[PDB]
């Protein structure tokens, strides 16, 4: 809500015509990034040590007994950004142009995407996928050259 | 014979009209084709 | 070599020798006969054409095809690329006594 | 609701009221086909387009031509079933109406001349089913709509072309629909240039001169005439005030007597406004202003005829004087302000060397015809043929239209041929873009891109066949006799039909379909590409087009790729969209008015859309007011944002129309990542039908429509009552009104039983229905291999837990119980076929007969007299099932075998085996077989037996048919008479036909008597024709290849059951592989001793995140629980009203559900049977985006009386004790695959080898050795295993002596090596030397 009121203020400024568009771009994108960081702090402090368990004493907490966190802390699977994907807003999105989008994501996998949000996920998804398919030939080509020398 | 028939005439019908027997019809029919070039990729992709 | 239908399979090459020998035949045949050298030229240009196309079909002129309309594999091509000998059947190879 | 809905109801939780019921789905293919066939009068399409485009055709004289009238097709000779039986392409025959018209050339056109107005057969034409497919040699095959770059005109510029510049260059491209291409282009030097089809460059002005043309009118056209007047000494000159705009005043630019402007002073808008204000056009100016300016036109002295200055020549003051002397006190000049109107043309013109028009014609020719000596008519006819001939050039006025719009004309249509105004308007617009006004186009935008459906391509092939025709036509027209030469005396239909064949069997698209899965087939129809001719290639194509464009939305599902090198090239359409009639696209949109969303629709383009501003269905309406929230997520301009409410043009309809079908059917995926989504929907198509039809219980809702629209099923074409039933056929009586009056209203359906899938899997049908019941139209009557009650069944739903187990689910891997195996539920079928040929040889005929030598009588036992297997037999690899033998020669042998047979002394055979045998490693069941024999080769014993059996079976079926029909009509015969007198038993006992003599009311009834006679004769006549036609259809032998005397074939039946290695998956990425089956006692289990079905490793989800599978699990435990409530209530056998409350309560549970239902409407046994249908668990529909919510998972697990956490204390199968903590449990609906070890794995000891290279082969089908890439060799380079290296180089592969040596040494026990040298080495050396050099070996 704070972010909404602030972008409404910056909207009123750009309407007024003092601030420009690329300035505004950097302004908005940085403050959304700060919002994501705050959400990250929130969810991590609200998960990793969310567990209060008492032994022979009033209250005390230790490392959580939640499955997800111990999967992250073992290094078996997961990572803080991945848990953010399921739980928090996950950052922002670059379209196939290479630009970076002004309105990041609001909900998560737990709640459910929007139509547009998943339609937007598509772009960078397919980008990284075609890269998955098509960075390897470089490697094999390179490789047989290298050994062909040596 | 196609114009006359509207369809493909049989080895016998032409055994009559061509004036020679089905032996030579089927015989020549066995013969008249050409070789088909080992290097063809019957593998639709360039694998085979 | 044959198949069930008495229907065979052939190389890309045999026609190369076939055209070459036939054009030689035409050439010598016309040398028996004391023609103008115009046709002599034309024939021998066909000759060298067939020759260097054998050595490399799709190097010099508009490449040569059969009824395929695919160009015809040179000698050189067989030594060459991945389906060249080196990479195809001399370094990587099918093998007996294995499975998957 | 409808009957089949009543039987099994799937709940739904979408709330957003949809407007639309979906269309038919495969409309597009059938419609292009229809277009192609259908007799367009005027908008000529396909066929008629061709004949119109081409005909009439005449001769060289001016007498004789050939004239279209009309056409027709016939019925197929062969029905569908006989075509796929015989391995025959289905098709229809063709007739066309031709008129050999000639004209008396002695007369002007004394048209009372010979006419052969007659008809011509030529060529059959393959045809479509009512479903879409074409069968080719009895092979159902598919061809796919493609997209390419729409024709016409396309502009662009490259960023950085020469390194010193590092600057942009604007360029154009255009094409027609048909004919040659053409390219305009600038250079860095501010000059237009030209080339056709990418021939070399030209200065455009050369061609401009070629156009009957002069420079005078150029400079009239492109530029204004900046006029001067030398009024007796000094220069005065006219001036529009807005010519000096942002211009620096060269001199003190003044007036009659007034300075507005000093020198070196910018002519602002103010001074232009003054100049404007004071009506000042002429200005006193320095003569010096001119020198450097360019004359407008050629000027002379009239006495001379000689140019004091040539046109396109810079000016001076000596020339000023000279010209004023020659009688010129006015001088036009060329305007040039880079600001206002500046120089590009005259640059090229001074560059343009070609002096006269003919120089232009000939150099244009010469680029067109380099080397060739030019003549006039050569170049003239040439140029006009290129772009001014109707024949070699057309726009397909979609072009023409587009060009009006690329020119913003009024018009839309025209010819297929240019005009010059079009050309120059393009030139002008191009330079205007160069100046900055206007733009170049975009790419990946959909209005640049046009489809190509079938009938288009059919048409193209057709008319090129007409080319292959018309050459020979023209010759035999101009050449042959005219009076006698019939129209068809010249005709050759052979290249036409043969080209039809080539395209139908060799194209990229002519392809075998995927009927493993109705999903897979139907989506395969709905695939699209950009490949082949007028297409692209992998290695040449790149990244950008594979990617997404915003305007895919509403028109393409972006989710749909094969996980391979076609990463974005391949893609399928989305749901609700449609085509522009031209070949572009559209999509419906809800119009929005005054804030009020108008429910109307407009199938907007890719282009109109961005102008308007458009809304989602995600919006929350203000109850038929306007949108609730002020800042409404709207979108225009190719982008979305927040606007006010009355500020809206349009709205979407539904929240799905972006998607494809396999995209549509995955619920909750809004809660899930896309990578797993797309690979899931890929695997969703590779599914296999199990033995039975188990439904899911989670749904989406659409699956009904897919279970319909494949046409795989029966339907109630017309409602009625079930009449007769069988396990292969079922009869219905059609309702009275649905029964047409002439028609008996009695439909049947004979059903496709055990039958080949193209991927070699089992096919059947079965009635999901009873007898003596009503049916409303459109209902399904028999389900399919993967379906149930008109709905899908790809899999089976069952029990799950998420926890590790002793390493047995380590990396995505799976464990299962054994119980399933005792239920056999994941068991399936396959089919395997073989064949053999009776040839004739040089020596004689291959003989098919049981008689064989060296007969292990074991397999001979199951063979008959003719050497043929008895049905219902069970076999395995190597068994002998057909006895064929061949005329043989003779041979000789070594003395050792000579002595051997001399002591034995068995004798005298000159014939060889050619029998057929099972492949080693297979076992299956005998089912059905067939022989084809020539009409002319005698039908063997059992051949005649089989065709006799077939005439029996068929004649029986048709007897039954007409028998039942005839009873249906004798009903009327008896009925109609009864109310005229009565012959109560005077009628019956005496014979039927002799009722024509009883009591008659003479006046009318005799007509009735003889009408009875008529129908009695008519019916048996109809059966007579049925009999004869069918019998000749059955008896007519076979058009078999030369030498092929007859052939048998066989079909098996094989099943396969589950085993570790067989892949398994659901719908969520959720792959996995099996390591084990587990005894039931080993199951961890519950307080209530119900063990589990599956275990899973909960590691990976928070990285891959297919979280909908969790919610599904919750629901999967949930739903069945109610079925158990009810199932107890059934076994406990409670009451109607209890369940009635229970259930309608259960329906009307969620928050704001769209669906609304009653029970009391329905009667009792309906309740009973739907309850019988739901006891296993009530099914549900999750709309993928407007699904239900967790509150309605949790309200629901409550009602099931479970933990709303859905997670339980469980006990150990091995130890019985409790584990640490609970585990989530429930049901998900799972699938098994084509990828299965039995068809996959392989071993190769020793067998065949290559021929040129003597090397082992590849492929399990031919006992294939496994290749090693050379990097596997680099491995032991890094280890150094010289002897294994040697081994695998030489003996396993090439060395003959080595492999032999090793074989015998091992059988001696000897494990010792010997090398040779690879064959390939010497092979090379020979080849090398054939290339003609002396390679040679420096021997030691």
Residue D183 forms beta bridges with which residues? Answer: D195
Nearest by CB to C100, from D1266, D1270, D1327: name it. D1266
Residues of C in contact with B38 (CB under 8 A): 9-12
Q: In this structure, are residues D1083 and D816 in contact, taking their beta carbons and an 8 Å threshold?
A: no
| Cα–Cα distances in angstroms (integers) from residue C40 to residues C21, C22, C54, C60, D318, in the given order | 16, 14, 21, 22, 67
Q: Does domain D827-937+1038-1056 have CATH number 2.40.30.10?
A: no
What CA–CA distance (Å, rounded) separates D1258 from B39? 17
CA distances, D705 to each of B23, D668, D792 (Å): 58, 20, 10
Distances (CA, A) of D334 to D290, D296, D355: 11, 5, 21
Q: Do D1103 and A126 count as a contact with CB atoms less than 8 A apart? A: no
Q: Which residues of chain B neighbour D1042 with C-beta distances below 8 Å? A: 26-27, 29-30
CATH 3.30.70.890 is right for the domain spanning D574-654: no
Tell me how far apart the alpha carbons of residues D1149 and D1279 are, in angstroms, rounded to a whole number: 70
Q: Determine the Cα–Cα distance for residues D1248 and D1256; give it in Å rounded to an integer.
A: 6
Buried b (16+ CB within 10 A) or exposed e, D281-316: eebebeeebbeebbbbbebeeeeeeeebbebbebbe
Q: Are D1150 and D13 in contact, with CB atoms under 8 Å apart? A: yes
Contacts of residue D1037, defined as CB under 8 A and 6 or more positions apart, other chains included, come to D933, D934, D935, D936, D937, D939
- State the Cα–Cα distance between residues D382 and D396, nearest whole angstrom: 22
Is the CB of D1042 less than 8 angstroms away from the CB of B22?
no
**Are the C-beta atoms of C12 and B38 separated by less than 8 Å?**
yes
Which homologous superfamily does the CATH classification assign to the domain defined by D151-223+342-442?
RNA polymerase Rpb2, domain 2 (3.90.1110.10)
What stretch of H or E contains D172? strand D168-175
Nearest to C66 among B30, B33, B37 (CB): B37
Check B22 against D936: CB less than 8 A apart: yes
Q: What CA–CA distance (Å, rounded) separates D60 from D477?
A: 8
- Burial label, D715 (beta-carbon count in 10 A; 0-12, 13-18, 19+): middle
- Where do runs of H (alpha helix) occur along D38-183? 46-54, 80-86
- Give residue D179's region: left, alpha or beta (phi > 0; psi -120 to 50): left
Contact of C59 with chain D, judged by CB distance below 8 Å, is answered with no
Quick check: B30 and D1042 CB within 8 A? yes
Q: Is D515 helix (H, G, I), strand (E, B) or coil?
A: coil
Q: CB-based contacts of D458: which residues, under 8 Å, 6+ apart? A: D36, D46
Q: Taking a C-beta distance cutoff of 8 angstroms, is the pair A62, D1078 a contact? A: no
Q: For residue D113, what are the CA distances in angstroms to D105, D463, D473, D485, D764?
A: 10, 29, 20, 14, 63
CA–CA separation, A40 and A89 (whole Å):
8
DSSP 8-class letter at D919: P
Q: Which residues of C touch D1242 (CB under 8 A)?
A: 99-100
Nearest CA among D492, D495, D394, D422 for reference residue D180: D394
A114 to chain D: nearest residue by CA? D670
What gap in Å lies between CA D973 and CA A41, rounded to an integer? 90
Yes or no, beta carbons of A86 and D1105 under 8 Å apart: yes
A82 with D1274: Cβ contact below 8 A = no
Displacement of CA D772 from its chain's centroid (Å): 43
Residue among D1242, D1246, D1318 whose CB faces C97 most closely: D1246
Whole-angstrom distance, CA of residue D67 vs CA of residue D44: 17
Contacts of D1191 (CB under 8 A, 6+ apart): D1151
Burial A13-47 (b: 16+ CB within 10 A, else e): ebeeeeeeeeebeebbbeebeeebeebbeebbeeb
CB contacts of D936 in chain B (<8 Å) are: 11-12, 22
Rg (CA), chain C: 19
Count of helix runs (H) and strand runs (E) in chain D: 34, 57
Paired tokens of A133: 């398919």
- Residue owning tokens 């397999």: D859
Distance CA D792, CA D503 (A): 35
The conformation of residue D713, written as its DSSP 8-state character, comes to: S
CB contact under 8 A, D671 and A111: yes
Q: Is C97 on the interface with B (CB under 8 A)?
A: no
Chains that touch A (3 or more CB pairs under 8 A): D
Question: How are strands ordered across the β-sheet holding D650-651?
Answer: D596-601, D590-593, D650-651, D614-615, D632-636, D639-643
Q: Which of D1050, D1058, D1057, D756 is nearest to D925 (CA)?
A: D1050
C7 vs B: CB within 8 A: yes
- Selecting from C5, C8, C12 the residue whose C-beta is nearest the C-beta of B39 gives C12
Q: How far is CA D217 from the centre of its chain?
A: 53
Contact across the interface for A126 and D547, Cβ inside 8 Å:
yes
Provide the total of helices (H) and of strands (E) in chain A, helices listed first.
Answer: 6, 0
The shortest CB-CB distance from C10 to any of B30, B33, B37 is to B37
HEC profile for D1156-1185? Answer: CCCCCCCCHHHHHHHHHHHCCCCCEECCCC
* Cis omega (within 30 of 0) for bond into D898: no
Resolution of the experimental structure, in angstroms: 4.3
Greatest Cα pair distance, chain B, in angstroms, is 50
Of C9, C70, C73, the CB nearest to B36: C9
Same fold, D712-786 and D827-937+1038-1056: yes
Q: Dump the DSSP string for D214-278.
A: -HHHHHHHHS-B--EEEETTEEEEE--GGGSSSEE-SS--B-SS-BS--TT-EE-HHHHHHHHHT
Distance CA(D176)–CA(D750), nearest Å, equals 52
The closest of D180, D206, D181 to D193, measured between CA atoms, is: D206
Query: CA-CA distance, D614 to A122, in Å (whole number)?
Result: 21
CA dihedral sign of residues D1052, D1058, D1060, D1065: positive
Is A20 strand, coil or helix?
coil
CA D309/CA D298 separation, integer angstroms: 7
Q: Which secondary structure element, helix H or strand E, spans residue D1084, and what is its range?
A: none
Query: How many angstroms separate the CA atoms of D781 and D750, rounded?
Result: 12
Contact between chains at D837 and C93 (C-beta distance less than 8 A): no
> With the C-alpha atoms ordered B11, B16, B17, B19, is the resulting torsion angle positive or negative?
positive
- From the options 3.90.1150.10, 2.40.270.10, 3.50.50.60, 3.30.470.20, give the CATH code of D655-711+787-826+1057-1240: 2.40.270.10
Helical H segments across D978-1081, by residue range: 1002-1035
Around D1049, how many Cα atoms within 13 Å sit in the side-chain half-sphere? 10
Out of 1.10.10.10, 1.10.1200.10, 1.10.150.120, 6.10.140.1670, select the CATH number for domain D938-1037: 6.10.140.1670
User: Do the Cβ atoms of D1184 and D664 come closer than 8 Å?
Assistant: yes
Chain A contact present for D640, CB below 8 A: yes
Q: Which residues of C touch B39 (CB under 8 A)?
A: 11-12, 73
Sign of CA dihedral D893, D899, D901, D905: positive
Least CB–CB distance from B30: residue in D491, D493, D1043: D1043
- Sorted by sequence, the CB contacts under 8 Å of residue D415 that are 6+ apart come out as D390, D395, D400
3-state secondary structure chain C: CCCCCCCCCCCCCHHHHHHHHHHHHHHHHHHCCCCCHHHHHHHHHHHHHHHHHHHCHHHHCCCCECCCCCECCCHHHHCCCCCCHHHHHHCCECCCCEEC
In the CATH scheme, what architecture does the domain D712-786 have? Answer: Beta Barrel (2.40)
Residue C58 has φ and ψ, to the nearest 5°, of -95, 40
Q: Are C68 and B40 an interchain contact pair (Cβ–Cβ within 8 Å)? A: yes
Closest CA to C13 of C78, C84, C94: C78
Q: Print the SS3 string covering D1256-1294.
A: CCCCHHHCCCCCECCHHHHHHHHHCCHHHHHHHHHCCCC
SS3 readout for D745-792? CCCEEECCCCCCCCCCCCCCCEECCCCCCEECCCCCCEECCCEECCEE
Instruction: List D174's β-bridge partners, or say none.
Output: D153, D182
Report the residue of chain C nearest B36, measured CA to CA.
C9
Q: Rounded CA gap, D558 and A123, in Å? A: 9
Structure tokens at D1090: 């119900």
Residue of D nearest to B26 (CA): D1042
Give, in degrees to the nearest 5, the angle at Cα D368 between D367 and D369.
90
Identify the H or E element spanning D6.
helix D3-7
Query: How many Cβ atoms sit within 10 Å of the Cβ of residue B19?
Result: 7
Contacts of D1266 in chain C (CB under 8 A): 94-95, 98-100
3-state secondary structure of A64: coil
The conformation of residue D848, written as its DSSP 8-state character, comes to: E
Asked if C11 and B38 come within 8 Å (Cβ–Cβ), the reply is: yes
Distance from CA of B4 to the nearest CA of D (A): 10
Q: ∠ CA D82-D84-D88 to the nearest 5 degrees?
A: 85
Please tell me if residue C66 touches chain B, with a CB cutoff of 8 Å.
yes
- In sequence order, which residues have a C-beta less than 8 Å from that of residue D250 and are 6 or more positions away? D263, D264, D289
Residue D236, Cβ density class (10 Å: 0-12 exposed, 13-18 middle, ≥19 buried): middle
With contacts defined as CB-CB under 8 Å, which chain C residues touch D1263?
none
Instruction: Name chain D contacts of A126, Cβ cutoff 8 Å.
Output: 546-548, 558, 561, 567-568
Domain boundaries, chain D: 24-150+443-573, 151-223+342-442, 224-341, 574-654, 655-711+787-826+1057-1240, 712-786, 827-937+1038-1056, 938-1037, 1255-1340
Q: Are D1182 and D1150 in contact (CB under 8 A)?
A: no
Cβ of C11 and B30 within 8 Å?
no
D937: nearest Cα among D839, D864, D843, D1034 = D839
State how far the Cα of D780 lies from the Cα of D788, in Å rounded to an integer.
Answer: 10
Best C76, C90, C94 member to test D by mutation, with max D CBs in 10 Å, is: C94
Range list of H helices, D278-356: 318-326, 345-351
State how far the Cα of D1118 lies from the Cα of D1109, in Å rounded to an integer. 14
Closest to A27 (Cα-Cα) out of A43, A7, A45:
A7
Q: Give the one of C7, C8, C73 whose C-beta lies nearest to B39's C-beta.
A: C73
Question: Is C2 an interface residue toward D (CB < 8 Å)?
Answer: no
Three-state DSSP at D119 gives strand
The neighbour count for residue D1315, using CB atoms within 10 Å, is 14
Distance from CA of B41 to the nearest CA of C (A): 11
Q: Give D-chain residues touching A113 at CB under 8 angstroms.
A: 670-671
* B1 in reach of chain D (CB within 8 A): no
DSSP class per residue in D795-842: BEEEEEEB---TTTTSSS-EEEESHHHHHTTT-EEE--EEEEEE-B-S
Tokens linked to D347: 């640059």
Q: Which CATH number fits domain A1-135: 3.90.1170.50, 3.40.50.970, 1.10.132.30, 3.90.1150.10?
A: 1.10.132.30
Contact across the interface for A119 and D658, Cβ inside 8 Å = yes
State how far residue B26 is from chain C, nearest Cα, in angstroms: 13
Which H/E stretch holds residue D986? none
Task: Report d(CA D993, CA D902) in Å as an integer.
Answer: 81
- For residue D870, the 8-state DSSP code is P
Rama region for B7: left / alpha / beta (φ>0; ψ in -120 to 50; rest): beta
Nearest to C55 among D1288, D1289, D1331 (CB): D1331
Give the position of tokens 């060889």.
D912
In sequence order, the 6+-apart residues with CB closer than 8 A to the CB of D402 are: D150, D151, D152, D153
Task: Please write down the HEC assignment for all residues of D679-708.
Answer: HHHHHCCCECCCCCCECCCCCCCCHHHHHH
Which of D677, D1103, D1105, D1223 to substitute to test the interface with A, most A CBs within 10 Å?
Answer: D1103
How would you class A146 by CB atoms within 10 Å of its CB: exposed for 0-12, middle for 13-18, buried for 19 or more?
exposed
């Amino acid at each position: 809500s704070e972010a909404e009121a602030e972008v409404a203020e910056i909207q009123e400024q750009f309407q007024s015509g003092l601030v420009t568009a690329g300035e505004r771009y950097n302004k908005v994108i940085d403050i959304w990034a700060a919002a994501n960081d705050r959400v990250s702090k929130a969810m991590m402090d609200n998960l990793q040590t969310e567990t209060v368990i008492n032994r022979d004493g009033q209250e005390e907490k230790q490392v959580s007994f939640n499955s997800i966190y111990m999967m992250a802390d073992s290094g078996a699977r997961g990572s803080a950004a991945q848990i953010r994907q399921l739980a928090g807003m996950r950052g922002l999105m670059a379209k196939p142009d290479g630009s970076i989008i002004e309105t990041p994501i609001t909900a998560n996998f737990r709640e459910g995407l929007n139509v547009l949000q998943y339609f937007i996920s598509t772009h960078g998804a397919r980008k990284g996928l075609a890269d998955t398919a098509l960075k390897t030939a470089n490697s094999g080509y390179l490789t047989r050259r290298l050994v062909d020398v040596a | 014979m196609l114009q006359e028939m509207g369809r493909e005439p049989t080895p016998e019908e032409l055994a009559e009209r061509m004036l020679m027997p089905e032996d030579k019809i089927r015989k020549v029919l066995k013969i008249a084709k050409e070789p088909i070039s080992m290097e063809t990729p019957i593998g639709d992709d360039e694998d085979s | 070599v044959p198949l069930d239908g008495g229907r065979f399979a052939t190389s890309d090459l045999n026609d190369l020798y076939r055209r070459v020998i036939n054009r030689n035949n035409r050439l010598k045949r016309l040398l028996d006969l004391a023609a103008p050298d115009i046709i002599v030229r034309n024939e021998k240009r066909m000759l060298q054409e067939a020759v260097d196309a054998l050595l490399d079909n799709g190097r010099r002129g508009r490449a040569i095809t059969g009824s395929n309309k695919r160009p015809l594999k040179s000698l050189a091509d067989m030594i060459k690329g991945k389906q060249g000998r080196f990479r195809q059947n001399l370094l990587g190879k099918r093998v007996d006594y294995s499975g998957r | 609701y409808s009957y089949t809905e009543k039987k099994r109801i799937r709940k739904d939780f979408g709330k957003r009221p949809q407007v639309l019921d979906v269309p038919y789905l495969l409309s597009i293919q059938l419609d292009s086909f229809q277009k192609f066939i259908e007799q367009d009068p005027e908008g000529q399409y396909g066929l008629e387009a061709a004949f119109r485009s081409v005909f009439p055709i005449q001769s060289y004289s001016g007498n004789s031509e050939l004239q279209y009238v009309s056409y027709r097709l016939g019925e197929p000779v062969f029905d569908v079933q006989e075509c796929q039986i015989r391995g025959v392409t289905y098709s229809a025959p063709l007739r066309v109406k031709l008129r050999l018209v000639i004209y008396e050339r002695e007369a002007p056109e004394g048209t009372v001349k010979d006419i052969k107005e007659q008809e011509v057969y030529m060529g059959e034409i393959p045809l479509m089913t009512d479903n879409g497919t074409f069968v080719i040699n009895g092979t159902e095959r598919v061809i796919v709509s493609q997209l390419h770059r729409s024709p016409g005109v396309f502009f662009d510029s490259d960023k950085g072309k020469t390194h010193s510049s590092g600057k942009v260059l604007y360029n154009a491209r255009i094409i027609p629909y048909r004919g040659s291409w053409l390219d305009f282009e600038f250079d860095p030097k501010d000059n237009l240039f030209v080339r056709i089809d990418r021939r070399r460059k030209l200065p455009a002005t050369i061609i401009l001169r070629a156009l009957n043309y002069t420079t005078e009118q150029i400079l009239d056209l492109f530029f204004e005439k900046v006029i001067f007047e030398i009024r007796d000494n000094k220069l005065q000159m006219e001036l529009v005030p807005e010519r000096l705009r942002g211009e620096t005043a060269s001199f003190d630019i003044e007036a009659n007597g007034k300075v507005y402007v000093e020198k070196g002073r910018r002519i602002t808008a103010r001074h232009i406004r003054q100049l404007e204000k004071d009506d000042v056009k002429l200005i006193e100016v320095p003569v010096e202003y001119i020198a450097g300016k360019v004359v407008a036109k050629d000027y002379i002295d009239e006495s001379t005829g000689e140019l004091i200055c040539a046109a396109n020549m810079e000016l001076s003051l000596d020339l000023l004087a000279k010209l004023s002397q020659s009688g010129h006190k006015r001088i036009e000049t060329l305007f040039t302000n880079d600001l206002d109107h500046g120089p590009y043309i005259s640059e090229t013109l001074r560059v343009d060397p070609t002096n006269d028009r003919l120089s232009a014609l000939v150099e244009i020719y010469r680029m067109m015809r380099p080397g060739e000596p030019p003549t006039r008519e050569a170049a003239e006819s040439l140029f006009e043929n290129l772009f001014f001939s109707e024949d070699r050039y057309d726009l397909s006025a979609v072009g023409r239209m587009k060009f009006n719009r690329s020119l913003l004309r009024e018009e839309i249509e025209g010819s297929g041929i240019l005009s010059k105004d079009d050309i120059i308007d393009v030139m002008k617009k191009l330079i205007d873009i160069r100046n900055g006004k206007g733009e170049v186009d975009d790419i990946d935008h959909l209005g640049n891109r046009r489809i190509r459906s079938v009938g288009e391509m059919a048409e193209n092939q057709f008319r090129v066949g007409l080319v292959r025709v018309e050459r020979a036509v023209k010759e035999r027209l101009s050449l042959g006799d005219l009076d006698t030469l019939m129209p068809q005396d010249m005709i050759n239909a052979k290249p036409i039909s043969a080209a039809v064949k080539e395209f139908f069997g060799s194209s990229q698209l002519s392809q075998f379909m995927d009927q493993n899965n109705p999903l897979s087939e139907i989506t395969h129809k709905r695939r699209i590409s950009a490949l082949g001719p007028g297409g692209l290639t992998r290695e040449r194509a790149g990244f950008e087009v594979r990617d997404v464009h915003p305007t895919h939305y509403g028109r393409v599902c972006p989710i749909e790729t094969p996980e391979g090198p076609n990463i974005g090239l391949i893609n399928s359409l989305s749901v609700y969209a449609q085509t522009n009639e031209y070949g572009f696209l559209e999509t419906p949109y809800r119009k929005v008015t005054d804030g009020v969303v108008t429910d109307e629709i407009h199938y907007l383009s890719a282009i109109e859309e961005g102008n308007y501003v458009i809304a989602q269905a995600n919006s929350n309406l203000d109850e038929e007011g306007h949108f609730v929230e002020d800042l409404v997520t709207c979108r225009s301009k190719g982008e979305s944002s927040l606007f006010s409410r009355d500020q809206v043009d349009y709205m979407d309809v539904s929240t799905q129309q972006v998607v494809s079908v396999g995209a549509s059917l995955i619920p909750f995926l809004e809660h899930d990542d896309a990578n797993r989504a797309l690979m899931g929907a890929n695997m969703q198509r590779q599914a296999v039908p199990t033995l039975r039809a188990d439904k899911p219980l989670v749904g989406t809702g659409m699956e009904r429509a897919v279970a319909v629209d494949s046409g795989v099923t029966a339907v109630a074409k017309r409602g009625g009552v079930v009449q007769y039933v069988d396990a292969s056929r079922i009869v219905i009586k059609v309702n009275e009104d649905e029964m047409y009056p002439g028609e008996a209203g009695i439909d049947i359906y004979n059903l496709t039983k055990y039958t080949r899938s193209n991927q070699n899997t089992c096919i059947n049908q079965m009635p999901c229905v009873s007898l003596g019941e009503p049916v409303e139209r459109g209902d399904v009557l028999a389900d399919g291999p993967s379906t149930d009650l008109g709905e899908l069944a790809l899999g089976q739903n069952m029990r799950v837990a998420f926890m590790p187990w002793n390493g047995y689910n380590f990396e995505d891997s799976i464990l299962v119980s054994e119980r399933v195996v005792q239920e056999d539920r994941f068991t399936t079928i396959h089919i395997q076929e073989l064949a053999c040929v009776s040839r004739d040889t040089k020596l004689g005929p291959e003989e098919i007969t049981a008689d064989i030598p060296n007969v292990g009588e074991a397999a001979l036992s199951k063979l008959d007299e003719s050497g043929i297997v008895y049905i219902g037999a069970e076999v395995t690899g190597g068994d002998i099932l057909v006895g064929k033998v061949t005329p043989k020669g003779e041979t000789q042998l070594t003395p050792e075998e000579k002595l051997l047979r001399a002591i034995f002394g068995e004798k005298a055979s000159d014939v060889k085996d050619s029998s057929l045998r099972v492949p080693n490693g297979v076992s299956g069941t005998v089912i059905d077989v067939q022989v084809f024999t020539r009409d002319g080769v005698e039908k063997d014993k059992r051949a005649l037996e089989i065709e006799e059996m077939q005439l029996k079976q068929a004649k029986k079926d048709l007897s039954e048919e007409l028998q039942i029909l005839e009873a249906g009509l004798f009903s009327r015969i008896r009925a109609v008479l009864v109310a005229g007198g009565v012959e109560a038993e005077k009628l019956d006992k005496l014979p039927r036909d002799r009722w024509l003599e009883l009591g008659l009311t003479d006046e009318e009834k005799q007509n009735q008597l003889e009408q009875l006679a008529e129908q009695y004769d008519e019916l048996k006549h109809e059966f007579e024709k049925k009999l004869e036609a069918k019998r000749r259809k059955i008896t007519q032998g076979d058009d078999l290849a030369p030498g092929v005397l007859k052939i048998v074939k066989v079909y098996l039946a094989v099943k396969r059951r589950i085993q570790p290695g067989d892949k398994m998956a659901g719908r969520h990425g959720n792959k996995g592989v099996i390591s084990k089956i587990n005894p039931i006692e080993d199951m961890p289990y519950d307080e209530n001793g119900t063990p589990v079905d599956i275990v899973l490793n909960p590691l990976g989800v928070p990285s891959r995140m297919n979280i909908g599978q969790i919610l599904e699990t919750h629901l999967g435990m949930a739903a069945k629980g109610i079925g158990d409530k009810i199932n107890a209530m059934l076994k406990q056998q409670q009451e109607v009203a209890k369940l009635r409350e229970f259930i309608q309560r259960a329906y009307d549970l969620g928050a704001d559900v769209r669906q609304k239902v009653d029970l009391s409407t329905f009667s009792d046994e309906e309740v009973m049977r739907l309850a019988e249908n739901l006891r296993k668990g009530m099914p549900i529909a999750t709309p993928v985006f407007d699904g239900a919510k967790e509150a309605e998972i949790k309200e629901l697990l409550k009602l099931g009386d479970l933990p709303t956490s859905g997670q339980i204390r469980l006990y150990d199968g091995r130890t019985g004790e409790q584990f640490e903590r609970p585990v989530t449990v429930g049901y998900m609906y799972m699938l098994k695959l084509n990828h299965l070890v039995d068809d996959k794995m392989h071993a190769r000891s020793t067998g065949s080898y290559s021929l040129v290279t003597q090397q082992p082969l590849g492929g399990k089908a031919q006992f294939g050795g496994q290749r090693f890439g050379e990097m596997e060799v680099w491995a032991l380079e890094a280890y150094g295993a010289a002897y294994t290296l040697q081994e695998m180089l030489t003996v396993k592969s090439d060395d003959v002596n080595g492999r032999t040596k090793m074989y015998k040494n091992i059988v001696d026990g000897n494990h010792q090596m010997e090398p040779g040298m690879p064959e390939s080495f010497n092979v090379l050396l020979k080849e090398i030397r054939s290339l003609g050099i002396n390679i040679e070996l420096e021997d030691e």
